[PDB]
Amino acid sequence: GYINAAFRSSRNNEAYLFINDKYVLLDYAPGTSNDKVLYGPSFVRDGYKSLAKTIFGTYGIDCSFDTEYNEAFIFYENFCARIDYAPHSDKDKIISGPKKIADMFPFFKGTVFENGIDAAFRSTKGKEVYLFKGDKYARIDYLTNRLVQNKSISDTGFPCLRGTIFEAGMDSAFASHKTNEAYLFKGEYYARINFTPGSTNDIMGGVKKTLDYWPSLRGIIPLE
């Protein structure tokens, strides 16, 4: 039971992390630690009124990514929804869905992404998102609803992950409030990366143990 999904809040330096059927709201304070739990751990169904009687409320959220304003796509197995997460209030609502992935994103039909997605993060470019499944990644535009390029190997688009535990897949991710940086998680490990839409990038600090650098998560992960 490690971090299964995450997205960047519209609130500065804040991020929602999903673990099993629970979530935490974190001030992740980039470049220090110093990170601090703001809310949770609590059941998704308790913190998100609009998700209470849904599969997301029962089983939690296994992938997500922020889009714009106070909205985010959330996933569980082959299903997804777009929600308004109304940060710091009880006014969350389902905007679109819930739908199967294939009905929300027709271009994933007959692909490995059809039955579920491992992780995703929001790009700094237009309305683009990177999504990950097994050792593959996709790059999409969620507004025009299109695949920007062929699905390919994670290391083809992210050469800096060659030779690390992340080359074979990742469990969760979110974009930082710092431009062109992102966090990737897998088991007890994380990495902070600098990406640039195009190619040639780097890992800032290498693969670190998560609890060594996110002290706020000590009594939380791994969740029994």
Site residues (vs Cl ion, CB under 5 A):
54-55, 62, 77, 116, 138-139, 149, 151
Rank residues 66 and 118 by Cβ distance to Ca ion and give the closer one: 118
Neighbours of 25 (CB within 10 A): 21
Single residue of 14, 21, 62, 66 touching Ca ion by CB under 5 A: 62
Single residue of 40, 47, 60, 98 touching a copy of itself by CB under 8 A: 98
3-state secondary structure of 140: strand
| Among the listed residues 123, 100, 140, the one whose alpha carbon sits nearest the alpha carbon of residue 180 | 123
Residue type, position 79, single letter? F
Using the rule CB under 8 A, is 79 a contact of a copy of itself? yes
In the window 1-30, what residues touch Ca ion (CB under 5 A)? 4
Output the smallest distance, CB 116 to Na ion, in A. 3
Rank residues 91 and 167 by Cβ distance to Ca ion and give the closer one: 167
Spatial distance between the Cα atoms of 34 and 29, rounded to a whole number of angstroms: 6
Neighbours of 41 (CB within 10 A): 18
Rank residues 14 and 171 by Cβ distance to Ca ion and give the closer one: 171
Using the rule CB under 5 A, is 119 a contact of Na ion? no
Residue 103 binding target from Na ion, Cl ion, Ca ion, none, CB below 5 to 8 Å by type: none
Single residue of 30, 87, 97, 169 touching a copy of itself by CB under 8 A: 97
Burial 156-195 (b: 16+ CB within 10 A, else e): ebbebbeebebeebbbbbbbbbeeebbbbbbeebbbbbeb
In the window 19-38, what residues touch a copy of itself (CB under 8 A)? none
- CB of 121 closer than 8 Å to CB of 77: no
Q: Cα–Cα distances in Å, from 137 out to 40, 168, 191? A: 31, 11, 17
Using the rule CB under 5 A, is 75 a contact of Na ion? yes
Q: Cα–Cα distances in Å, from 8 out to 64, 69, 214? A: 10, 11, 16
Using the rule CB under 8 A, is 86 a contact of a copy of itself? no
Stretch that binds Na ion, among 29-37, 60-68, 162-170, 203-211 (CB under 5 A): 60-68
Stretch that binds a copy of itself, among 51-59, 113-121, 139-147, 175-183 (CB under 8 A): 51-59
* SS3 assignment for 163-201: CCHHHHCCCEEEECCCCCEEEEEECCEEEEEECCCCCCC
Residue 120 binding target from Na ion, Cl ion, Ca ion, none, CB below 5 to 8 Å by type: none
Instruction: Give residues in contact with a copy of itself (CB under 8 A).
Output: 50, 53-55, 58-59, 79, 94, 97-100
